[model samples]
Target chain A: ACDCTGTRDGGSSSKDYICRDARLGPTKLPKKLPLSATVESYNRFGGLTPIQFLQTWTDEKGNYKYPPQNGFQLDANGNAINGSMVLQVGTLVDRFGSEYGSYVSAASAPYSQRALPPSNLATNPDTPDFPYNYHVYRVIKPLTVVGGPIAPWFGQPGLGAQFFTGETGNVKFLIEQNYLQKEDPSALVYKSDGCADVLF
Target chain B: ACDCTGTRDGGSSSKDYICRDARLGPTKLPKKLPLSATVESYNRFGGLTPIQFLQTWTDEKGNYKYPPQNGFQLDANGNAINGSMVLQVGTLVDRFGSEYGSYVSAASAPYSQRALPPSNLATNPDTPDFPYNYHVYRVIKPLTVVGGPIAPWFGQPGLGAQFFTGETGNVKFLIEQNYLQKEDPSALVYKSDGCADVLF
Candidate 1:
């Protein structure tokens, strides 16, 4: 009939099942996965479980026919696979509190490599190039602490700027100190300390 | 005559001149200061330069009066004062890209005993009975690396979970992955990985 199964970006007539939890129904998948859980799975399977991304490679022509073996599992082959999963590789949680896979594909792919991106592109068409698109998400996890370097660097503790855990906390801290007056519908009013100009 | 220069709470009638850059005008202060710069100043003065937060003591009747030289320099009391500063303590950059200050006064203080709290109240007004409103001023200093434990944590490196820096970088990382499609006015679509939920 019709090969309506989830396949790689350039799969040729080959049908492979998209990774989805049977319990979540046809198109449902877990929106987030805890870091500890991911680590545990990775450790238990020697960095093989909870597959980061899936890969299907054919012998030569890159065509999948029902012959000896339909497909071969390429396992985790990127640094995102090991303990270094972060914004650049592996999987990350979006601002919406949903867990999703990230795709930092190899510079030169063996071809036919398919995996889920961090955010859903099908349903959330608004994010045409999501993760990079909206650059927005509702925070789900409680970020108790956040810090980074002085200027050049992005994040690090005790060395650079830091932030609060939740939206409520953020608002409270700002108001109490007069750094901010109040939060508006689309934006919050940035109060001046007589030091610098606030650019939102 | 009422000494209405800059007195609100139980501050004594003595004016200690609120810290402000001359160029910014009176009743004005540098809204944001890099932690590193503050530290540099602190180091140069042996913790005596770049006066951070100012202080004023009340009288026996819980009222500030004009006798005892009641106002003294808190001298960057908390860690945010000496080393560690946060959105609720030293200063933090807002989502708007400008830096801002936060206030979370100590529950019971010698009054000027400022410390770090989880969040702010003004921006998030819902937290009225918050740490107690004591809008004080301090010097803005630049910050420089911060690190902490691992696992079950978000925003920290190699720990439990992490988040994006600035915002632009975040969008770029996600977009390149095909995980996110685009950014809508309100929300971004949540994608799923057949693997696990993103804990971020």
Candidate 2:
């Protein structure tokens, strides 16, 4: 459902399944850790891998782009994904360290569409409004870094303005089918139980 | 000072002043807000301005580079400045709102050098260490944005790898001399009165 104000935001109709949205916000987190926090975290097919992270972006005729290796973990149709995965990098020894703390970084879920048209030719609540909402998510994500060599333009923020990635190490996300929602055509699934978020 | 383990971290000698670091780990926060939260925060001397912010960056041969407009707020000697300025945007209205909260963003403070060599030539305690500490600070800043376009290499982290910029809008930062630490020659001044960070 997700009728923002209506009662359909939850699991009201069994036949309706859930609501997968083209509009990206917050994030649809998974129930379990997608990949292990080790250097060798993978499966028979593919899994999460530790890699370098760089926070930089640019605008190409309205479309936002990160460095060759910096992007949001999105779905096939270019729907932005959001959420974070905590990492506890430990060997057989550090796991027993008395001062072990967890590091958290924002997983590039809720990715922006590479070619999100800046206009909604036919606006429909049930459909993706690429032009309008993308402005908020796409632009808002990179506010933490701005100024210097040159740049595009981008938020109606309050007092303070900043974002941080608690994790020093950036991990490469590899989307697997088993954890994604299969019922919804939107492919908005990601190990979540929000039936209202997927199409039944 | 800042002798990690020695008592020299704080101010002890008036001749020596405080220590300005080339290697950025945590930030050297300023005592007051750098820029005003309102859209009109500046003086005849060119004070803080409300502009855009973007969290993104890249690496050159041995240095790191941000998008045309992305970078760290460093000092004259290319020393990094770290710290966040909290904004209470009160456009003569919200100040009276039932709920007025502040927003914050990681200023381009503690900026990485655009041309830092990946090697420490002589390495003195008081002197700067380019090729080393820069690795930690420069590489650690953009852990939130990684994966996609395909590129370079980057952190040893804990379980939680994430950061947050409370403000939605990315404000442009302009470094002024009003609040910088001047005693030390590092030009690490930014409206502070520690009596040590600079050379007397």
Candidate 3:
């Protein structure tokens, strides 16, 4: 859980996010494929994206809210209105290295890893379900995944950080290149041949 | 565009978002899911499940920045904590639908119909190398997109809304749903197929 400080350049509100050092770190990206477009679009969800960009705000209502903070307002001549301060969150995953110890066949990856419409178990009961038996093994003390607002997008949710325990009781997690930024990447990453990823 | 007071339960804050009226019509249901003991047993993003039973507050900095707004921090014995004041602006199409129309699909459909990306244009330039067009048939002046402090879950850019009108005449605009919430069946409209469509 290392935290870093940084800043946006150019000085305008548009440039400030680039200047502001959003406190963020590496997080677990979901292993799910096809990377369906959710509340946000596909480009923003690509690897090494921003964390502050995963917006959380105090709403006009007494209760706070987290909206899909994506774009800016434009005027007649096509100029930005500089509406709000945005935070970005990046997703990184630590790959189960071949040398980590025992190498499990990549072909043995579970079939339960596909995306689905949210379940009442997590969305209704208010308790998140574990994806694998191993997730339960590592989290025995609190008997919980992370919580609070950051809990929604950080820890295991960030990108590569998810893991399960082995029958022998050792824990394993994935590593991701999640980062936080104020502007879109000059270059982006995409699955070239089904997760055989390369950045352009 | 137009500001009005609502008769339903509204919270005290700068933006007077009505919890049971306007663009957002609440459809919150009581918790309904089975409790489980398996670790990493279920997939979250795929199933419409809630990941955490409770949530605290944090500023963008990851530190606890504020108090819990709508729900209790952690109830006695660690039961679930339910809150409804939270809102999300999922994407450009979502924001446009909730903010512009009275919550209608035909009225809120995305403008530029680009199927998958590798998009070679920026919202700033508003120029694309494709043959995209919007047939909404009506031209609303001022091209309104952003106006207030909203959640960052809507757009894909680092900051500000991007209203791109491509060189090939493809124009794209996003909408807002972070401020509209209503509870009557007359207000909220969703589909089992997917999409929390706005009801007119």
Candidate 4:
């Protein structure tokens, strides 16, 4: 049953799915196939795969952090395809005994701690899903200067702002999937507070 | 009294206080100024305004931040002073917070919780010995970015690959000498972190 309060504001738009039959008035049916046949055809010929992740962004002002972004995409086969994957190198190890800790430089550079294992692929090497590295870009966030700029043109913040890759990293994120299947879509998943944030 | 091994690169020409002769160099310097010359300066001409904070910087970057020129210049005086100041916003209030917690969004903003008064400055407003409200900047710390960038171009090896400022903010600095005082045949001062850093 649809709430009388709404259906227009991002709500479902049908009656059987709701209580209002007045909202449902469809009579045009394609003559080619039935619902079950359509479902079977899809199940037999098309399979769904969750797309992998890639790189991230960051701001230099503070810690190099990882933030979320747009959803995943699919391939011609209707299977979710993997994409770019970037991650942050966390609390370092000072391997050199140089007063500072040590670090790993590239995600694809051997030391990458990946989020998912290589599986269900045409060629599943030990390569990480969405295997890749990310770059750092300098950006400016505006803040109000005491005796200077006004709103919108507030003073310039530091230069280290950054966004990160979708895969494994020390960060919280909301992940979305894009694919059609017989089962309910389990795509729009949200991960918060570094629950899934793994550290190596 | 200098730990030659612990010193940064270069010798006397480098001009590093820690690496130089501590006794006659950075060591002999008094922990705090003699007293508030402001009260005396004020008692003389009602000019005892608290020392004002001018600008911040990141000297390790090797180049000046945007807008080119960094540091501050005194109006009446022709000296270009660079540093931080100490202030007592209130009895329980302070400019900088403790080594751990103490962070205020802005100077005019009210104090929220228990914090370390600005470490770089003294909390006692009565102390005329120490210049109040001196400019401070984030000192370049050694940092290690695991699986990130290379060193040297960034900084030292390991943790110091590039420093990440502590939550309390990094390397605060200040310019000494009252706005009215003239340099005594040019007092020699160490360079500050703000010379090349992006101001917040």
Candidate 5:
């Protein structure tokens, strides 16, 4: 076990996780397939950016909230808002090789669909059956803002690092560019133009 | 475009996203393969829990930090700590049907490997060339605590919902169950014992 008291990193955040004995390595890329977009015309609120709108949600007492784990965002009556603004899912990856997907959704549109109404899980304690909607994403690249607040926090990512998504109740509009800024020859560039990858 | 002024949720957080016209749907599960575990012996810090230790980092200015995007973590002299503590990556999911993986890592060990030292990205505009490390995760489920703060913030999920992870500098240890608490037939169950997934 390693101790947390040393100065191994020398004040650098990059872990540069590399195996010593050449035992573990990255896996092969999955079969690249087209993501389905069967819902046709997707609808969204034009006022908010895709990431901004997606991050917002409503709670059980009619309270509006930004994240699902947080408490209820209150209304004029000091209660939940329970607004209809739902969320869309997207693709992400972490510095480590852990993958992220949907917990409630079954699959993306033109492919599969979401599970039954969250109320169906009311009897099941494992269900996150709450009023808010949310999705997770990875940081492909990061940029330092000049004189910006850099307090270790998990909030919104910069415009470029954020994911773009939309939903038509069933199908979703998600995009994952293998290369966020330039030609990342090493990235798993998606060759198709669609939402919700079935075989990413 | 939808409006941000309506109260469609009515104070409930559940979206119950359902598709109309039965257009888009979930996809078929890919061939589930066993994750690789070639490294054999793995190292970890005994002081902190997996989630706690994984969330910490240090910046170039010798400042320690959390969430990567934040400022450097401090030292006794009020500068970056540049501590020896590093971070590990993990997997996650959200309410919507989006898939997430790694950006900096090539794949989990026994699968592939990380691209290279982050310094390699010094010339790339897209590389998040910062002295920080981060991973993204989803809320498979959410629970409300009795008499607590509810400020619509994004922080750590409760114990059960958090992902478990470990790193041996190169290879990683990640665990994702088809069910967090109870078994749900609708979820994808991994049938293996190892670090990184190749064709999951």
Candidate 6:
């Protein structure tokens, strides 16, 4: 019985009446709803991340797929690889904070499945039950190649970023670090023996 | 002749000097070490994780093997699976914070390879190149029997925590949630009005 007669989206121009769903409803000026029921209705669901909107994707074969926009890859068989690697990478960058790694081995330990495995392997042969090994490898790609690839060819899986170059034939490691240089090997490892972390 | 040393370890009875290693160098007496050189001398490569020390376990054929203690498994072919699944789990738990999942989908998504792929896949058909597709599936293991299984069970090679249970006959999915409950359907997909993150 509320007089709702005006606009469709925002509401009517009238002060006393408002239009909602092509119908007029009495506008209760000033905050607080009539009862808690009204408050509970609006508080039903909360906001979600942009990624959540695209819950999943499926091809004609009923095979699941992720929205390619996220930069996730599908196997040759067309299986969806989880996109959480980016999130894991972001988390690792935060953990390193100010502490720096000079060598690719020291810095890139986080990304290797050998060093930091994926978070989702609940109870596979590789990863055991949950709550155990839940770390991510922050792959450090170097600019200048000292000896081998930026990220080592050896190490854990999912450790370094790989790209299948149309020219490389095989998948090649990608550069991850910005100011990486082929410094002395000794300079790569942590040398601050006497240095202490003093909280000022 | 120079005084070899007073005591052995800490310069027992002496109040001024201390004994370290073989040579009895000048000691700062009451305190530990006054000289930065002495302090730095004691500093060296510290102990490593138990896993690090036991790394590179190989078979007679020289194939690498993951330490069972670390909870990693070798494929039927006897290859090591990275043991970072627990780390990934920890990362997800940290991300969820206090937010609880009524159903298991939210909690399990990270474990599903479809969501989070395992890091290691040495020349597996899926996950060919690097950063091209690095994701981990947060798997959701259901309790009550559904129409077989919620997820059709097809994803990347090393994504799920799969175990060949001698009892189950088939590779059973491992635990992915802390307190997962078998809830009804419809709550499965994140259904918003008409929002879709289209992949162009």
Scoring each candidate complex against the real one, what DockQ results?
Answer: 0.02, 0.02, 0.02, 0.01, 0.02, 0.02
State residue B128's C-alpha deviation in candidate 1, in Å: 40
Of the native A-B interface contacts, what share survives in model 2? 0.00
Candidate 2, B-chain TM: 0.17
TM-score of every candidate relative to the true structure = 0.18, 0.17, 0.19, 0.16, 0.18, 0.19
lDDT (10s digit) by residue, model 6, range A64-178: 3423312222322333222111111211111111123222221221222222211112222232221122221233441221111111111122222221122211112222232
Best by lDDT: 6
lDDT of 2 by residue, B1-200 (tens): 11222112333322222122111111222122121111111111111110100011123331324222122233223332222222222110011011112111122211111111111111223434221121111111212221111001111110111112223221111112111111221222232221111111
How do the candidates rank by lDDT, highest first? 6, 1, 3, 5, 2, 4
Residues B29-130, model 6: lDDT tens digits: 112111111001121111212122123232344233433412222322333232111122211110111122111111121222211211211111232221
Report per-prediction Cα RMSD to one decimal.
21.2, 22.8, 23.1, 26.2, 25.8, 26.6
**Chain A TM-score for each of the predictions:** 0.20, 0.17, 0.17, 0.14, 0.16, 0.20
Tens-digit lDDT string for candidate 1 (A43-134): 11112222221123122342321211111111113111111111222111222222121111111110011112222222232322221221
- Residue A185, candidate 4: C-alpha displacement in angstroms: 38
* TM-score pick, better of 1 and 4: 1
lDDT tens per residue, model 1, B1-200: 11222323323321221222211112222122111110011111111112221122223442322211111111112121112222222221211111221111111111101111111111212322212222321113322111111121111111111112222223233234432222221111122222332310
Query: Considering lDDT, which of the candidate structures 5 and 6 is the better prediction for this target?
Result: 6
Two-chain complex of model 4, DockQ on C-alpha atoms against the true structure: 0.01
Off by over 4 Å in 5: A1-142, A145-180, A184-200, B1-142, B145-181, B184-200
Candidate 6: regions farther than 4 A off: A1-107, A110-160, A163-180, A184-186, A191-196, B1-96, B100-200
Q: Residue B25's C-alpha lDDT in candidate 5?
A: 12
TM-score of chain B of 5: 0.16
